Amino acid sequence: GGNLPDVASHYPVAYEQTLDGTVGFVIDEMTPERATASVEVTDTLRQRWGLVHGGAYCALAEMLATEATVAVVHEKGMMAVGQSNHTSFFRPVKEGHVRAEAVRIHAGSTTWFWDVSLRDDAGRLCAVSSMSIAVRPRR
Amino acid sequence: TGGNLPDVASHYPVAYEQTLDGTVGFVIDEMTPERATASVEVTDTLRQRWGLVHGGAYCALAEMLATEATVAVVHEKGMMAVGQSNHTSFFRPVKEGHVRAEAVRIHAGSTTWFWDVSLRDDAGRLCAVSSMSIAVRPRR
Amino acid sequence: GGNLPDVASHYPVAYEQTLDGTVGFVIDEMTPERATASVEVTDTLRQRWGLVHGGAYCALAEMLATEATVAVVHEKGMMAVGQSNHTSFFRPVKEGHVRAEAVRIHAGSTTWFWDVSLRDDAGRLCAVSSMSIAVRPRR
Amino acid sequence: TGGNLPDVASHYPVAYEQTLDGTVGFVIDEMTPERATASVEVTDTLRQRWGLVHGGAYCALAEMLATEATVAVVHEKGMMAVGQSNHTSFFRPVKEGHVRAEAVRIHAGSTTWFWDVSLRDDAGRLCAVSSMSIAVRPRR
Numbered sequence: 057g058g059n060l061p062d063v064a065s066h067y068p069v070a071y072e073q074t075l076d077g078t079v080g081f082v083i084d085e086m087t088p089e090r091a092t093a094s095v096e097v098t099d100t101l102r103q104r105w106g107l108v109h110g111g112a113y114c115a116l117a118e119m120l121a122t123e124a125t126v127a128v129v130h131e132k133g134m135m136a137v138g139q140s141n142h143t144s145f146f147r148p149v150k151e152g153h154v155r156a157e158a159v160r161i162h163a164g165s166t167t168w169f170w171d172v173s174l175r176d177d178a179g180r181l182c183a184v185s186s187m188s189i190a191v192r193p194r195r
Numbered sequence: 196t197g198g199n200l201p202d203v204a205s206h207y208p209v210a211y212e213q214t215l216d217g218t219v220g221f222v223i224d225e226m227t228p229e230r231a232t233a234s235v236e237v238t239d240t241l242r243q244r245w246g247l248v249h250g251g252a253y254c255a256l257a258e259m260l261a262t263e264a265t266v267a268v269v270h271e272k273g274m275m276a277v278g279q280s281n282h283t284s285f286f287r288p289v290k291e292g293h294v295r296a297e298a299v300r301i302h303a304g305s306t307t308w309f310w311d312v313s314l315r316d317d318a319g320r321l322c323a324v325s326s327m328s329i330a331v332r333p334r335r
Numbered sequence: 336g337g338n339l340p341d342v343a344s345h346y347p348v349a350y351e352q353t354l355d356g357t358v359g360f361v362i363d364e365m366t367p368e369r370a371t372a373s374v375e376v377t378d379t380l381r382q383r384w385g386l387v388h389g390g391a392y393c394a395l396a397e398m399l400a401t402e403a404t405v406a407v408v409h410e411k412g413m414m415a416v417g418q419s420n421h422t423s424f425f426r427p428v429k430e431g432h433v434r435a436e437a438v439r440i441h442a443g444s445t446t447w448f449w450d451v452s453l454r455d456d457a458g459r460l461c462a463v464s465s466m467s468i469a470v471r472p473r474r
Numbered sequence: 475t476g477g478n479l480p481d482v483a484s485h486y487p488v489a490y491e492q493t494l495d496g497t498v499g500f501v502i503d504e505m506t507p508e509r510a511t512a513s514v515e516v517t518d519t520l521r522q523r524w525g526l527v528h529g530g531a532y533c534a535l536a537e538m539l540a541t542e543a544t545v546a547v548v549h550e551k552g553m554m555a556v557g558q559s560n561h562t563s564f565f566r567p568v569k570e571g572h573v574r575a576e577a578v579r580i581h582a583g584s585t586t587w588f589w590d591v592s593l594r595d596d597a598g599r600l601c602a603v604s605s606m607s608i609a610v611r612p613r614r
């Protein structure tokens with residue numbers, strides 16, 4: 057759909073109805089150590105002033121780092137959810153696309169950490185996200 | 196005023212209902228120079244595939260609230276305000292109801308304002324917090 | 336010594352030899368939900384430019400939030416260590432004292448979170464720290 | 475040059491050996507506009523009562539490194555540089571040896587520089603990371 061990891065037979069919310077499907081996030085590559093995703097800029101991703109909403113970068117990074125963790129851990133009986141999301145903004149984006157690259161830097165038993173880079177169509181670094189993902193056994 | 200955001204301009208590039216904010220339904224309640232509140236009714240549009248409120252939704256609500264709260268004061272002074280850092284920490288998920296946010300200003304420097312935002316559930320539990328650092332600069 | 340919680344019979348490093356005792360951190364009050372500490376500014380707390388080192392605020396906050404967690408959890412078979420320390424600086428300090436107040440905002444099963452405020456002798460907010468403390472069973 | 479910090483001034487308010495940096499023994503190794511390294515030998519002065527390197531020690535090493543690395547370039551340009559945000563995340567403790575830090579510049583704006591700092595052990599493992607946001611302003 058958004059090309060999210062297929063790890064379960066049923067999902068509570070269909071992609072098109074989720075926040076992710078509504079703004080248009082799509083996973084591109086995915087491996088245990090690195091994943092990418094992107095989104096086309098539309099007014100649905102912007103704030104009233106015409107720039108891509110800061111929350112959009114946050115959300116792309118959160119989905120990308122978390123889903124990339126899920127991809128590995130789901131099949132191991134674990135649940136993966138974001139515990140901390142620290143996004144820093146360097147340059148705005150008015151149009152085009154937002155591309156994210158998440159690089160795994162730590163995979164502990166209870167926490168995985170990913171560095172996410174958010175770039176524009178020109179390849180410029182527009183924002184970064186330090187994603188801390190909690191890993192716990194499913195209930 | 197579509198989601199009750201501060202009327203500081205005659206015109207805006209994107210209408211409320213078309214923005215991310217309008218799409219997910221964020222609405223500002225109170226707004227003062229030192230404190231602001233807003234909320235959103237949870238619907239699937241606010242959730243991730245697993246059925247919970249998306250982490251990014253809390254980050255966005257906090258971001259919009261703190262920034263707009265800064266804009267309410269500085270716009271007229273000829274400044275622009277945009278977030279420079281958003282650090283959101285998640286304590287408990289939200290599956291349904293509303294997400295209620297309260298932003299309290301803790302520092303108002305000449306170049307940066309800082310707000311502590313608490314995000315609660317209908318039962319009043321602290322579900323997430325966001326430390327928002329807002330850059331303040333003069334418009335071009 | 337530094338008035339740290341007395342929870343064990345032996346400690347690997349004596350207060351006076353630790354980083355805390357070397358810069359002079361002292362716990363004032365301590366309860367499960369709130370704790371305070373302070374330090375006199377000396378050159379040992381400063382950087383070459385004469386201001387209190389940013390790392391000093393970080394360290395005060397980290398010791399204070401962690402030790403306050405230890406105070407409750409130690410006796411329960413758990414270990415408490417900092418997992419994330421996010422310190423933001425609003426105003427420098429050149430002399431006097433640094434006073435910290437840590438307020439517990441979340442006490443989960445595996446994570447405790449504290450908001451730490453760092454003030455000067457005039458009571459001004461000089462910095463803040465969001466301390467995320469991991470709680471795990473002792474080995 | 476006491477701990478090999480950038481010589482950008484004739485005189486400094488506090489001598490190396492007297493500062494926090496000198497007391498704990500931080501030493502700068504390489505230093506360029508886009509990348510800097512430093513290290514410290516672990517001793518009790520770097521530890522907490524439980525025998526591990528104090529979290530605050532990593533935060534301080536990262537802080538000093540990123541800031542001084544910014545100072546090396548901007549001082550001569552009449553700017554002052556001070557950290558505005560230090561976010562350090564801890565992955566694995568260090569009990570002894572050294573702590574080695576590498577700061578990589580990722581953004582150099584007109585008012586903020588941002589450095590990613592990695593803190594490793596003697597075995598090269600990633601023990602902590604720090605996101606350092608440095609404010610750049612003109613001196614008074």
Ligand SMILES: CC(C)(COP(=O)(O)OP(=O)(O)OC[C@H]1O[C@@H](n2cnc3c(N)ncnc32)[C@H](O)[C@@H]1OP(=O)(O)O)[C@@H](O)C(=O)NCCC(=O)NCCSCc1ccc(O)cc1
Nearest residue numbers: 164165166167398401416417469471522529564565566567
């Ligand atoms: C935060 C925590 C526990 C999270 O675990 P994780 O990310 O899931 O990683 P992990 O569980 O796979 O284990 C990584 C390593 O952490 C340590 N660790 C993890 N869990 C434990 C535990 N229950 N007991 C002891 N060490 C542990 C071990 O060194 C472990 O490596 P190993 O399994 O190969 O022996 C782990 O990353 C960590 O220990 N990071 C270091 C925390 C740190 O050193 N903070 C600074 C020290 S406390 C500050 C302080 C200051 C003043 C005071 O007076 C008191 C405290």
Ligand SMILES: CC(C)(COP(=O)(O)OP(=O)(O)OC[C@H]1O[C@@H](n2cnc3c(N)ncnc32)[C@H](O)[C@@H]1OP(=O)(O)O)[C@@H](O)C(=O)NCCC(=O)NCCSCc1ccc(O)cc1
Nearest residue numbers: 304305306307382389424425426427538541556557609611
């Ligand atoms: C980040 C910064 C500059 C941003 O300004 P702001 O948030 O907009 O607030 P503001 O502009 O209204 O000014 C607040 C205070 O900051 C200081 N400040 C601001 N701009 C400047 C400046 N250009 N020059 C000197 N002090 C300044 C002043 O004390 C000011 O109080 P004042 O205006 O009443 O004199 C301000 O919040 C600040 O200075 N925070 C303190 C930063 C700090 O002390 N970091 C720790 C020291 S650096 C670590 C280090 C370690 C080892 C080394 O070898 C070197 C460095």
Ligand SMILES: CC(C)(COP(=O)(O)OP(=O)(O)OC[C@H]1O[C@@H](n2cnc3c(N)ncnc32)[C@H](O)[C@@H]1OP(=O)(O)O)[C@@H](O)C(=O)NCCC(=O)NCCSCc1ccc(O)cc1
Nearest residue numbers: 119122137138190192243250285286287288443444445446
């Ligand atoms: C991070 C974590 C697990 C840490 O646990 P803690 O701080 O030690 O707190 P805690 O263990 O005492 O439990 C607090 C609550 O968290 C939830 N929780 C904790 N552990 C679990 C678990 N193993 N399974 C399910 N829920 C859990 C429960 O609601 C629990 O409350 P309860 O025990 O009364 O039922 C917990 O604080 C938490 O669940 N916070 C909410 C995390 C969150 O909602 N992040 C956003 C959702 S994921 C983003 C995403 C975006 C797009 C995608 O496509 C996928 C994911």
Ligand SMILES: CC(C)(COP(=O)(O)OP(=O)(O)OC[C@H]1O[C@@H](n2cnc3c(N)ncnc32)[C@H](O)[C@@H]1OP(=O)(O)O)[C@@H](O)C(=O)NCCC(=O)NCCSCc1ccc(O)cc1
Nearest residue numbers: 103110145146147148259262277278330332583584585586
């Ligand atoms: C934070 C800030 C201003 C600091 O400047 P800096 O780090 O020193 O970098 P810089 O000064 O060299 O400038 C970098 C770029 O920032 C933008 N910028 C900087 N200063 C300004 C300014 N005064 N006016 C407009 N754009 C500016 C420009 O695009 C500039 O590129 P350019 O100089 O080539 O034109 C800059 O990094 C930045 O703009 N980051 C993007 C902030 C952002 O886009 N946050 C998300 C949007 S706000 C969320 C929101 C949500 C809902 C609402 O209802 C309202 C707001």
